Amino acid sequence: SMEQVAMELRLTELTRLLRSVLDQLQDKDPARIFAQPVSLKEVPDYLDHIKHPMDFATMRKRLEAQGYKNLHEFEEDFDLIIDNCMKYNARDTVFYRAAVRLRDQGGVVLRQARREVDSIG
Structure with a gap:
């Protein structure tokens, strides 16, 4: 259907905007602390502590499969x-402090992303 195409164009354009958001957030992590999954070889107890691991690479895989339907989903993964x-x-x-700095700086970016997602629709 043409309606299904139009919805797919909207998802594609959201994906474009979220790709730009992802780049901007990740620049707030120049140490690359959050770039990749915590290694279960190097932190073998991690999953005893953290039930839903997340990292920028895993977000990028989800994004490129157009797997974020809305900004809320994407923010959920960033907050994790x-x-x-x-x-x-x-x-x-240094890890905790890096996360605080990422949260604070990312807030700025996310605030305008929300306006843009609402604005463009």
């Missing part, structure tokens, strides 16, 4: 990156 880190690592660690 931050929140997982802030639970597993103590306040006095």
Whole structure:
């Protein structure tokens, strides 16, 4: 149907906007602490602590399969990156502090992304 095509164009354009959002958030992580999944070879107890691991690469795979239907879904995965880190690592660690800085800086980007998603529809 033409309606199904129109919906697919909207999903494609959301995917475009979320790709740009993902790039901007990841630039707020120049240390690359959140770039890849926590290694279960190197942190073998991780899944005892963290039930839903997340990282920028895993988000990027979901994005390229147009697997985010709306901004809320995408924000959920970004919040897991931050929140997982802030639970597993103590306040006095470079990892925790990196997550705080990512959250604070990412807030700015996400605030305007929400406006754009509503604005364009």
